[PDB]
Amino acid sequence: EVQLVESGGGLEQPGGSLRLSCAGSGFTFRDYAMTWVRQAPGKGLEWVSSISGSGGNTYYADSVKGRFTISRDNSKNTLYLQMNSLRAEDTAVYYCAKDRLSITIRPRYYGLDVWGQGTTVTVSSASTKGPSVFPLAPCESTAALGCLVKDYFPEPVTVSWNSGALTSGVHTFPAVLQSSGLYSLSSVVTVPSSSLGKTYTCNVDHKPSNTKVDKRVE
Amino acid sequence: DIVMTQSPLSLPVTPGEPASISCRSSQSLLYSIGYNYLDWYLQKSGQSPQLLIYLGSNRASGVPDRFSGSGSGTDFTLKISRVEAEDVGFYYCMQALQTPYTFGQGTKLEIKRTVAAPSVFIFPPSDEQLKSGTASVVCLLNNFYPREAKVQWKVDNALQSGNSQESVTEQDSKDSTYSLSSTLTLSKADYEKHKVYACEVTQGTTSVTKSFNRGE
């Protein structure tokens, strides 16, 4: 399968720097132009940069010129975005995308056919804060359980259940921004009450604080 | 830069019925005969964008027959012949004729299903949280339709406002329902001064209140 895996996102100060990576597998990396697209919180899609198969030609959005550099290491099957002089406006999920087939003189376009999973860049003067994870348990035949992921910065937090083994009936809600400027999120699952006396663990990942919390909900 | 404009911006559709999304460009996207540099993408909630249509009319890998693209020059249309529940999300057109690549604003495809009552659950604050001096009380509204429902928090039968926040999931890809989570936030001192905590959920002719007693 043709796949793109991203890394390198995080929280940085204005004027700071960050490098994003996009690793390809299941295809010949050098045969394809590659593209970065971003999505600001609650907004649409915006093109950032494109690079030719060889790396000989580079293209940039006007707002990132002189700040961002697109590059690739074809021997490592990896696309890069060096992000210098970071601005608050750069806060977004960044996606890499497979672009035109480039083994003929004129490249052949087949759409942006494969996309990475995204990596998040947040540009703020505020410090990182890891989450406090608390159980949601009742005080019927179907019971709800969950985790409250409280007082973190910045977005995002990912939540899984039983290391990804439990997916049906999982609802992980959008975070709310509290008056404190910190986020709070809940994740819930519905389970049979008869087998409560089965273990249910939420797995909470917060990349910006380098923190993973597993919480067993009793 | 080439500007892409989509119409409509919100599209509510009954399952089985057709859907049509228009995309207009400020400049012609016809590079040569058969080469309109116009794509369509779907972004499902919490997912990366995925290719549907490229070069005006070509279905991408794995894309169901129900999706088709047509048009030329400046006027383009995505058609879904019969809308299914899993089609829910945001649809974007994109031009790839020139850099910068530019996208339409996005069209939110909504699924018009039957009314479903929420399953309501209430959660007390954990003992662990109470040690920090704050109490979060949580109310869950599970798998309901339509989106419009009201949560009213009550503490010893007194109506609460300005001390809760809520959020709602996007439409479920399988059953087309929404879910809602509301958090009531109190100091430990305020929490321990009261007994009955109640979340009242109002949807049309029905109000459902789930409650707990702090002492129990």
Numbering used by the authors:
A (entry chain A): 1 to 139, 145 to 202, 204 to 224
B (entry chain B): 1 to 216
Question: Which lines from the publication concern this structure?
Answer:
By engineering a small secondary structural element from the rabbit light chain constant domain into the human kappa light chain, we dramatically improved the crystallization of human Fabs and Fab:antigen complexes. Alignment of a human Fab structure onto a rabbit Fab showed that the longer FG loop present in human Kappa constant domains forms a bent and bulging conformation that would interfere with a beta sheet packing interaction. In the case of the FG loop, this consisted in replacing the septamer human sequence HQGLSSP (positions 198 to 204 according to Kabat numbering) between the structurally homologous T and V (position 197 and 205 respectively, according to Kabat numbering), with the pentamer rabbit sequence QGTTS (positions 199 to 203 according to Kabat numbering). The resulting mutant is shorter by two residues, with deletions of histidine at position 198 and proline at position 205, and is referred to here as ΔQGTTSΔ (positions 198 to 204 according to Kabat numbering).
One is derived from the publicly available dupilumab (Dupixent™) sequence. The most dramatic difference was upon incorporating the ΔQGTTSΔ FG loop. Dupilumab parental Fab yielded crystals in 4 conditions but dupilumab Fab that contained ΔQGTTSΔ yielded crystals in approximately 120 conditions. The highest resolution structure for the dupilumab Fab incorporated only the FG loop mutation ΔQGTTSΔ. All structures derived from Fabs with the ΔQGTTSΔ FG loop on the other hand packed forming a beta sheet between the G strand of the kappa constant domain and the G strand of the constant heavy 1 (CH1) domain. This interaction is similar but not identical to that was seen in rabbit Fab crystal packing. The pseudo-symmetric center of this beta-sheet is between kappa V208 (position 205 according to Kabat numbering) and CH1 V219 (Kabat numbering). Besides the FG loops the only substantial difference between the parental dupilumab Fab structure and the structures of the engineered variants is that in the parental structure the heavy chain CDR3 and light chain CDR1 loops are disordered.
